[PDB]
Amino acid sequence: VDTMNVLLTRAARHEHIQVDDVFLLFDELVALGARPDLAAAETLHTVL
Amino acid sequence: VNKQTQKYRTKLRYRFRQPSVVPLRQTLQQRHNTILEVLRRRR
Amino acid sequence: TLSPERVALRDELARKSRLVASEGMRYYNIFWVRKPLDTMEKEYYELKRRGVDHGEAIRKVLQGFYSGLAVKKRVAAIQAEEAKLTGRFITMREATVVLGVLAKLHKEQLT
Amino acid sequence: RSFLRFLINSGELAGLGWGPLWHASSDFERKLYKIGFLSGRNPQGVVDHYHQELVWRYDYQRTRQKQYLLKRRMEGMSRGA
Amino acid sequence: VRLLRHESSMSPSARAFSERVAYHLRRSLKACPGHIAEHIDFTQLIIQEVLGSRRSKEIYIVWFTVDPGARFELEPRLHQLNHWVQQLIIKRVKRRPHIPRVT
Amino acid sequence: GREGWLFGQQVQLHYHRFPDEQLITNLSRWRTGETPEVYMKLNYKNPATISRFLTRTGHMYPADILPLNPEAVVKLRVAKAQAIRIGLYPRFGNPFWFRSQKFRPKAYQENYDPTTYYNWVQTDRIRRYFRELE
Amino acid sequence: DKYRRVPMLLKPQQGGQQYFNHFLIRSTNDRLTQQDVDNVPPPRVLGGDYFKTRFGYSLVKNSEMTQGPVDYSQLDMWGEMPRYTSDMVFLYLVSRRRNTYAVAYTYEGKRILNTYTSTDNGHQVTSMYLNDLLPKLREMRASEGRPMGRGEKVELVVRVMGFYNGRQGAVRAVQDRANEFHVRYFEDITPFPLNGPKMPRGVFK
Amino acid sequence: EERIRELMMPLEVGENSFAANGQATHGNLFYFREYPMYPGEYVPAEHNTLSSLRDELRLDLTAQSLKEAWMRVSFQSVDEYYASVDGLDAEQIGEVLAALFPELNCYEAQALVQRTLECISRPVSAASRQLSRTITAEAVGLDNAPGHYTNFLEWMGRLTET
Amino acid sequence: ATRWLPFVSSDLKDYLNRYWAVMFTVGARPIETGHIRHYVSWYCTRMKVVLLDHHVYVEPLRQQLQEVSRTPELPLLFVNKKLVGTLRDVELLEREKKLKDVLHFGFEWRVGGSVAATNGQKSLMGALPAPYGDAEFFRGRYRGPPVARPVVSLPTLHPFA
Amino acid sequence: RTMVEPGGVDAFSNDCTYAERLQWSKELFRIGPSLAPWDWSEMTFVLSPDVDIDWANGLLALPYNFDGDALVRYVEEVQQEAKSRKREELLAA
Prior knowledge:
part of a larger assembly, 10 chains, B: 2 helices, 72% helix, rod-shaped, F: mainly alpha, 6 helices, 0% strand, ribonucleoprotein (chain G), Ribosomal_uS11_sf (chain G), ribosomal protein (chain G)
């Protein structure tokens, strides 16, 4: 879950990203054995 | 100087003396602390 | 601060006023004490502009102070006496003491 | 559960158990769980292990509880200072 | 401390100096400075002896109280006297191997 | 009943340290304008004053502990000597000691604590005062 | 070393690992609870008869009225000193390196009993002195005109001299007789030295 | 029973309570940790920190959105760099933010203005906020000069990031 | 050149201007004065102790001390005409190693951060600003050595120490 | 008041005889130094028809016929109790 938090934060704060790709990375992480957390949920929520 | 005054002057001289203070106890404590630190950090 | 001569006569006047006060007069409950003392020192200043023998001048101003204190005492006595004779109003301090003491008695009787 | 509750609590109440040393023994839930394991809920085994509970040496519950409560009190006093 | 030095475990000079110190301390203990006397409760204090080292570099005044509860009223005041005691030693006893440190 | 008493007595809220303290405070405040006579008493006639500077035993404190003006010290010593000569001061001892100390404990304490730095009788007085009032 | 072969994780052999999470969660919960919450004089005595019954001495004088006296009164030479009443027995216990003496005096300075003679020395001397003194007090008070009264214990002023061991034993001996001797003032008599007469050489050199 | 015993529970060597655990001879031999060991234990993250992170991300992304809007709509000289005048003014940022976001408060609008002004230089610039806690105005002797203090903190943080 | 005279003044400011380190005490608090004396003597700085119990001008000096320290606490220490505080503040400065300097040179380090809490030599590991913060959301972050804690209180050796 | 500063003395509140008030003042003055060693800044001495010793509310009411020796006895008892309490607490600790 720490990798998810770090990737989501350092991506949402990146400039040339797309929200489609942020959510796709979240989807890939959860498909892998990553447990969503309140922090990652908040990050995705602010991004949405 | 009368005997009474001589004796009282000596009594005062001993009672009110400024001793020579040199930090030997502090130096030894610092050396002890350094020795403990070295023993702790190194084998 | 104060000028040295002014503080000097003010000190002697303060001691003399204390003596005419709680000493022989026994007037611990005086009110607006500032006015009498200031008017007395002003009267002393007038008597010194004129030239009145400082001892005699201080005696005169002290006597005036005494008369003022006495008339103040008796006017206060008039109001207290007639206020107590008329039962409609009494005064503020006894209202405070009664409204506190009744509460204390209520608490005691509760205990 | 009923039988062990009676045994432990009534023994201590009558004054034949841990008594002042109650803090040296684990709580009733730990004692119930462990004695159930050790006796298979057999009655005679339950009595025997209730007596043997004087001997348990691998119960760290009270040690950790004392440690935690002492730390909590120490930090509370440091805050108060 | 662990032990208590025996009367026979000290040199005769240290032993001699010790009974002199004990005599003078017991005689003069009421004539301590007033700002310490006014708080010391002399009713409880007792001093068994003074032991000291060989050649009396150190002096050990062994003391206690009639009631054990007074040790923690008496100890700091007693330790505020360790200079007055040294001055008493300097003034009264003439044969001293050397003026000691009081404990 | 008595009627002069009601007009004589006056009701007070809180007691004074001493009855004239408020007057003294106001007088001092005006004297300063905001909006030692011990050298006269340090003599053989004033056992309390001379005892105010002595130890529990009647002897001298250390200079550091109780430092004084040299004239005050000389007068203290000569007054003590003269009083002891006449017999107006004990040749050994110091009464007035507790009377002179200033850091005194409370009745239920053992040491002085730097942190320290409607009664039924007056209720009955008020009750009887008002009872006579009507 | 003897136990060099055992693992370091078994040297102390930590245990109870299942309680740490519970303790963390409970500490956080109690912190939240604390935040939400955020968002000796002695007893009282009133009756005179009660005071008399409680303390054994009436407070009110309750005596003859000597009213209409002089308008100014003379002080006592020693105002601050304790109030020694007539019926107080003043016993002095003097200690020394080898010996211990114990005497008892009347309020007027009259010696009641002769002197008697380390820690055990003082304890025994004091116990014997008290045992022999109680009858002597009986006879002296009876001759005076004062019957004992059943259970009334003698009021005592105990004074000790000497910074020696025997003081502990003597005071313990006086304490052991509390039921009959009521100690009211325990004090010290060790004298303040002065110029004084000459002293033996052995003390000096 | 357990909750009452928790408060009745002894903690000092006394009567029937005593430290036979070698604490006098060996000392503190039992470890005790206040952190949940990541894989095994869990404690919910604190909401002050949750809100802090959420607010920082909100402000950063809003600042980037405004910067991209300005670039959609539309080099710095030495004089302009020294003056620290960006492509937009604080008044312009405040007015656009107030127009587009009604409910947003005055304090948050000022924060958005500051962050949008500062993102032209550094996107995150989270070093100054932290360094403010380590270095204090009084310590650096700059107490009644908050503008200079913040200027230095930004300078120092952006240098530390190198 | 002149006879020895003990210094006395009704003004706290005279004491501050005259003596480098001045402590006001009373005879009813021997232990606190002993502790402050221990610290000052350990750091070998001349210090003057004044007992207010028999000091004349006792009430003036006491009220002046109370108004300058904003608390009635008789054991008080002053250095460079400033207030270091009571035994608790002296102990705090000894804890974070600022007492040496407040005594010798008369100033408290305002650097921020504690020097007492150290595992070895003093360095800057963990001082640099953390990008984006989030020092808490690295659940697998390095947590340090396994600090041990006592089980029971180990009764205090002396009621004073 | 000057030697045993109590922070308050009330002899003139209760309606007694002048002889009784003078006698009570004389007894208080006699006690005086024996009562000195303790701070009475909190307690207020007053004349009463009966004794009451309210340490919490700082009141000390005594009859004109009161034994100064007895009052000193009681205050010394209080001091001894406090001293013994501190000694016992320190020994227990």
